[PDB]
């Protein structure tokens, strides 16, 4: 039900750092996991990180010396930041939640997204 | 990452006849695995987590089972909106990752 | 010319009860029994009660979410719960050793309480943030605020093992509890393990617990339950906890300076201060009689209670007048 | 010995009625009146003042696996209730009873101390009431209350009125 | 008792006397015989009456209360039953004793005094007109037939009425 | 003429003892101290006690077969039973919170005994009929009326899961047990599994049983044991019975009414048709009297005990004629 | 006492008189001393050495009794131990200070009544030979020799003998 | 010529009080409460106390190499412990049931000590030499007097499996324990296993234990723990003992008889060559009073304790001489 659109720069220069933000509506961070996840034209998805609103992070290793995500104070919006780009971050990014883990249960980790934005395309 | 593959890159099916589709995985993954919907100009769409269990507004169309390293997904048959792009998920190590998808038409 | 000999009489209607004869009238009179109290909870010697409110004494201390207002009432008189309390033990489960817990609190004059095992810290290889439906706070999932559900992070499960040595100077109590997930897939998904323990120790503590897998009649719609354990660590000792799954772990724990003389009441009196040396449920007695048939059951410098209407004395002459 | 209470007197418990040709009136007789009261006084304090007291709170809290325990603690509060309820009333029945008679007699000895002072100067009559065979003024009517009544000063008035 | 009459000033109780606890006995040219006197004696079945029963009524009823099993792991627990028991029976036994004995000490006391002012109030309906003598009675200056034994007991002694008779038999 | 004053002297003997003097004769006197009883178990307010004869408590609820006549019996106003009880827990084990649950069952004034879980349709995958010769019946071997023995069937044991919601609006009493073989020729024979659990569930209650295998002395000729569990259902819970062996089920139940002033007494006194305000083990007392010598252990409307020979007050004069 | 004999109609008592409580003082031409009634000093014993042993003996003996240990999560049965123990003491601390001091006040009226009684027996000896004078004395209105002063306390004395000296001496 | 009537008057000072005046002074009195004691341990009715000097029970009980000279006395009056005892348990752990076995013993007037299971001849394939510097004496390592440590012999551990039955006549108390290692290192090393057990049985007595590894604080220099478990076996009955390691066997079991009037006091009074029939831990009474306010502990027949400061009764006459 909640639902989600990426903004930002269609167009990062490799000097640059790359960032996006996804805006909520119809709905706030509310104790989920927050994920961004990438999508170069031709491939399959790449999982960057998830976060938490109250500050706890997840990162794939690979992206680590690179990719910070956190949120606002808006509380319905989150951002992804990539520094230095490499130019093989010409992609899609996508904005998702993690998957409750129960109706009753959440601040804990499912491994899987279930709302999607359609994403946003990044040309290096 | 544990690099997984889909072997069957394209299907070309042209009734709304049953399809499949497979991932396999280089280490087990128990059943730590989930299967996607992605189309252009759409939301991605989660279809099931766990191997075999659909998330809510998931079709019964969608199924599928498997473990460790080896994945089956079943289309029970193809409706016009359903010639997307699939690909699966392996959330049983750190860092999570996917398959490079397959392409139905 | 005559001289008469006799003694006063007066308007008085006071009887008194003797063994030869029930009714005698007197010219003065005495009350042995005090029959009345205020109707409010005053404080003994100026010092206020610990007011529950509507939770449960496995509410305060536990950190219940809902009963927040009370984590700062450190220095206790004695303590006024609500006939039927419902904030506490929010995530269902048995709380051991209740009544003797207690007791022990009833008598601890002033609660420091404290971080034990910062949440931020402690647990760089857990999930600290699990929060629950059941123990809502404004409407929004979250859990007791002094415990911390500890579950998997990136697929793994690293075994927990830390300890704490009490430099507090005095006895130190420390909550904790134990998950018992209703299906094994749980089990699994939150802890990555099969055959999880919890073990406990100190200098003379030992308690291991094992997980159970069951489905339990659902509350507060839960299906699993978390079970309490306590205990109390007496300066210079430590607490060692290990894990390999379903810790509920204890973030948070009272240093007791431990007193007398106070209890637990239960009312629904208001509180309205006067100097109550001598307090019951249904309010204060401010009398130096030495019995009372207020109530069986008090706090403080009272009367002591007896099954009796009256306890008059007669201290003047019998009222007949001529 | 008196036929009922004074309504009159209001200055102690114990006394006279004096009556002569040259006034009329009560008086309290304030010895007695304030060692009736004393005595009492302690008394009335020695109950109040012997009650044992320890203070804590008493309630006590069992689970539903601890009923033995549980009517134990029952079995001795009912006990110890019925123990206190039992002493405390027959107690005061007869503390209550030991007042009355000792003011009894009390008003009995004041009543003898005329009786020895007056002797034959008057007669008894039932009631509480002494007759004077002579004419008695304030003066003597002071001197029999105080005990200082100067019997053979009047016998001969007496010798001549009784008849 | 304290007060000295009864087997005292007076020898013995009546056997023959039967309607009452206190009396009289008299003797004169119309007869002789027993009268109870009834005011004094329910007087004193009343009083008494209502002693017995405040220690009787004053107490409460004994509820059910019955041992308890434990079991070989819980003697703490059987010793404090048994202790708890212990302690109430010494304590009701020893008042329940003392009670009585206090209360039959009192009681004869009581007795004692109301046979003694029975004997007083006699003596002040009389004064001269009768000698005081032994076993309770006195002797009478006068002639004092069954109309007069009445008027004494009752209270009602009309003194002056024999007083020339007694004047001139007291020499 | 002669007027005396006297007061009256028969030939009384009722002697009393006072401070100032040890025996003293008196003309009336009232006894205050009750020492009679009649020697039998009378009705009390129209109650019967129950009678269990032989019975041990276990005995009759557990349902020992030779504790048949003790079926009928739903209700009564105190608990008789044998001295030295024969008819036990026929089958060797120990009994749970025994003692506590004699407490709990003497203040039921009356039941239902009902089926829980019915033999002929609970269970169709699984033998329910284990028997004992220790639990023999006129030399037929047997066991317990109230509970059924569950053993594997064509060499099977499929996992026991089966519920009971309480809706009888009384508590209700659940019997079960737990079997421990005295090897593992034994507990593989009977549950095909070394590894079997018995698991009982409520909203509260909670708890797992293992099955131990060890070798004991013989008791009624058996080697192994059957612990005997219980615990009291709230109206309107659920208890849940999981189990993959050694699980000896409840068959019946009963749905219990409590009231007050019963208790348990033994006594080889005979029953009689009498009734009684106050009974004691060596007969029922009618008396109106404050004190009774009689017994410590009473239940009803009782005299109180005292160690006293004699409580005898003096009413009348002393007795001294001339 | 509340009868007013110790130290009020008898100004105090005899530090000359060793023999027992109650007693005489004479003094004529042949002689003077102090005697204790023997008659009343020993009833006034045996009267109360029953009482006093009878609080004594009624008491029962105390047999082993000692606390118990429990350990720290079994509070709730250490307070219900202490609380027994408090009960008892307190009631048994109450019901000996009050059954002294009730006891205490009784005797010395038992004594007070004692004394009041033997002087009443004389002044019933002696009647209008004798009158009362302070000190609770009798003054003679006849010679009054040793055999004379036995007579009067043996509760022998025949009044009328005296009578025609006492009758002169009345004036 | 006079004949007056009067009363004795002496020098006396016997002060008591009445309900009417405050102080009297008498020519008479009796004191009704004692209030010394002698500062002795004494005997009770010729028999001497049992002292277990700087020995808990615990230490005696077990054994405890200090406890050495405590071996020979069989019997005695009562049991006095010292207010801080030093040599209790020497290899730390939990004792079972440790209170109630103090209250069981107290009732013990005489004991006999037996070598129950025969260090020689019971244990063929173990090592029976096992000692610890916790429990040593006079410089050397050493253990239990009544206790025997069992490890393996040689790599291997065979099946412990042993009985006793009980034909002294008396209840005979059996100990032993059980040893929970620091770690696995250590559990290989003494027992070849990674998975004991240990089982006591007798016809109604049922236990198992498993060994909780752990590191734990260390205590008396040790890592480990060793808990200690006792039963009274019945005579007749047969104690059972099987384990596969971890088990310390009983050597030495006691054979009780229980009596009356004993008890277990703690007192540093010093014991004399003295008597009395009553006995506070300050020291003895030698007193024939009703009451005392000496101490609320006592052993043998003592007046009743009061918190009364005096109870003066008087016999004699209100001393007002002239
Ligand atoms: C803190 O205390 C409050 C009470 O003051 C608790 O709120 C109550 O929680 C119960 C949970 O069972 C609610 O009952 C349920 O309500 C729903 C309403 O749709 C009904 O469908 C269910 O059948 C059931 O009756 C109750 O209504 C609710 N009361 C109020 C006034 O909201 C609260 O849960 C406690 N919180 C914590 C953290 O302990
Ligand atoms: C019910 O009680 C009877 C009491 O007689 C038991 O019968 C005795 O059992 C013992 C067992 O050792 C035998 O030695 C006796 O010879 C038996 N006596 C008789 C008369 O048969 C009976 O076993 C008990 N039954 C149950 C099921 O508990
Ligand atoms: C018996 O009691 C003595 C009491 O002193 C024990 O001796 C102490 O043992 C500790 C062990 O850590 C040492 O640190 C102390 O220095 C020792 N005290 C002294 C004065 O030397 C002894 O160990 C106890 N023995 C047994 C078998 O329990
Ligand atoms: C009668 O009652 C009034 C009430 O005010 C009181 O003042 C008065 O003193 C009483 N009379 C006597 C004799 O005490
Ligand atoms: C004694 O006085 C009370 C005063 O309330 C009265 O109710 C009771 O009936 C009286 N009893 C008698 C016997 O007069
Ligand atoms: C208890 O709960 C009721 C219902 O939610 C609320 O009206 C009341 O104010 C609460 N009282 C306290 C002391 O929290
Ligand atoms: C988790 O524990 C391992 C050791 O078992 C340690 O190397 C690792 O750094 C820890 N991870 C975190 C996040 O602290
Ligand atoms: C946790 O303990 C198990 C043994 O129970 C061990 O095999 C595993 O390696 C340990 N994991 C960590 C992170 O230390
Ligand atoms: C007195 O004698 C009568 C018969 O005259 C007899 O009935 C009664 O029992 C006797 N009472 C006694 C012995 O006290
Ligand atoms: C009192 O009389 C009874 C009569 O049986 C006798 O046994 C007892 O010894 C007597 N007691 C005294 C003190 O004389
Ligand atoms: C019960 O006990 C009695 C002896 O008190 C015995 O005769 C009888 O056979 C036993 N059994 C039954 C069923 O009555
Ligand atoms: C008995 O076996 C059948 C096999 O199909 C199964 O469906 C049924 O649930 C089983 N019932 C039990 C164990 O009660
Ligand atoms: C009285 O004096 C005597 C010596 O004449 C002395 O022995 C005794 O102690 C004294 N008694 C008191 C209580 O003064
Ligand atoms: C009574 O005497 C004691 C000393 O025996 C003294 O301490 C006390 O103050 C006196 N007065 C009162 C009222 O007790
Ligand atoms: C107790 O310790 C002291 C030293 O503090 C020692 O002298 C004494 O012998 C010890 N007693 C025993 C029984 O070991
Ligand atoms: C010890 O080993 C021998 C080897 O032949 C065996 O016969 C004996 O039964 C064993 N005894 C034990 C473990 O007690």
């Known amino acids: 039900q909640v639902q989600l659109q990426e903004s930002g720069p269609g167009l990062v220069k490799p000097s640059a750092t790359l960032s996006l933000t996804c805006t909520l509506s119809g709905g706030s961070l509310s104790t989920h996991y927050w994920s961004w996840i990438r999508q170069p034209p031709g491939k399959g998805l790449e999982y960057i990180g998830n976060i938490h609103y109250s500050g706890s992070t997840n990162y794939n290793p690979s992206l680590r010396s690179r990719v910070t995500i956190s949120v606002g104070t808006s509380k319905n919006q989150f951002s992804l930041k990539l520094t230095s780009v490499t130019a093989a971050d010409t992609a899609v990014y996508y904005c998702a939640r993690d998957a409750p883990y129960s109706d009753f249960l959440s601040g804990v980790e499912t491994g899987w997204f279930d709302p999607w934005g359609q994403g946003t395309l990044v040309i290096v | ?105 | ?322 | ?163």
Not at chain 3, 85 to 112: I, K, M, W
Request: aromatic share 10%.
């Open chain 2, 1 to 105: 990452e544990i690099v997984m593959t889909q072997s069957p890159a394209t299907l070309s099916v042209s009734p709304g006849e049953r399809a499949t589709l497979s991932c396999r995985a280089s280490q087990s993954v128990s059943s730590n695995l989930a299967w996607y919907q992605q189309k252009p100009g759409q939301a991605p769409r989660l279809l099931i987590y766990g191997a075999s269990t659909r998330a809510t507004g998931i079709p019964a169309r969608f199924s599928g089972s498997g473990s460790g390293t080896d994945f089956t997904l079943t289309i029970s048959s193809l409706q016009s909106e359903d010639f997307a792009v699939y690909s699966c998920q392996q959330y049983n190590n750190w860092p999570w990752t996917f398959g490079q998808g397959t392409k139905v038409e």
């Open chain 3, 1 to 322: 010319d005559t001289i008469c000999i006799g003694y006063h009489a007066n308007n008085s209607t006071d009887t008194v009860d003797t063994v030869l004869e029930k009714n005698v009238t007197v010219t003065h009179s005495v009350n042995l029994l005090e029959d009345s109290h205020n109707g409010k909870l005053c404080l003994l010697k100026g010092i206020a009660p610990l007011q529950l409110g509507n939770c449960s004494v496995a509410g305060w201390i536990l950190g219940n979410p809902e009963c927040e207002l009370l984590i700062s009432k450190e220095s206790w008189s004695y303590i006024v719960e609500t006939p039927n309390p419902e904030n506490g033990t929010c995530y269902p489960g048995y709380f051991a050793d209740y009544e003797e817990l207690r007791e022990q609190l009833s008598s601890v004059s002033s609660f420091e309480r404290f971080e034990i095992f910062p949440k931020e810290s402690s647990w760089p290889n857990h999930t600290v943030t699990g929060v629950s439906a059941s123990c809502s706070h404004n409407g929004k999932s979250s859990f007791y605020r002094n415990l911390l559900w500890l579950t998997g992070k990136n697929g793994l499960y690293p075994n927990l093992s830390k300890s704490y040595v009490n430099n507090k100077e005095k006895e130190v109590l420390v909550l904790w509890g134990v998950h018992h997930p209703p299906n094994i897939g749980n089990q699994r998904a939150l802890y990555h393990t099969e055959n999880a323990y919890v073990s406990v120790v100190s200098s003379h503590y030992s308690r291991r617990f094992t997980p159970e897998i069951a489905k339990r009649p659902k509350v507060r719609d839960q299906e699993g339950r978390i079970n309490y354990y306590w205990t109390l660590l007496e300066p210079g000792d430590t607490i060692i906890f290990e894990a390999n799954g379903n810790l509920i772990a204890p973030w948070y724990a009272f240093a007791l300076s431990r007193g007398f003389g106070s209890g637990i009441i239960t009312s629904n009196a208001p509180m309205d201060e006067c100097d109550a040396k001598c307090q019951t449920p249904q309010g204060a007695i401010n009398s130096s009689l030495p019995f009372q048939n207020v109530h069986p059951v008090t706090i403080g410098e009272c009367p002591k209670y007896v099954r009796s209407a009256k306890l008059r004395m007669v201290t003047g002459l019998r009222n007949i007048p001529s």
């Open chain 4, 1 to 163: 010995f008196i036929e009922g209470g004074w309504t009159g007197m209001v200055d102690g418990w114990y006394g006279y009625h004096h009556q002569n040709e040259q006034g009329s009136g009560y008086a309290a007789d304030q010895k007695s009146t304030q060692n009736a009261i004393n005595g009492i006084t302690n008394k009335v304090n020695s109950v109040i003042e012997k009650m044992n007291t320890q203070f804590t709170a008493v309630g006590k809290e069992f689970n539903k696996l601890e009923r033995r325990m549980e009517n134990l603690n029952k079995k001795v509060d009912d006990g110890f209730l019925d123990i206190w309820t039992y002493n405390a009333e027959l107690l005061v029945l007869l503390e209550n009873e030991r007042t009355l008679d000792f003011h009894d007699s009390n008003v009995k000895n004041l009543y003898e101390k005329v009786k020895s002072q007056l002797k034959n100067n008057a007669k008894e009559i039932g009631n509480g009431c002494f007759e004077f065979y002579h004419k008695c003024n304030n003066e003597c009517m002071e001197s029999v209350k105080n005990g200082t009544y100067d019997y053979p000063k009047y016998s001969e008035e007496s010798k001549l009125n009784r008849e």
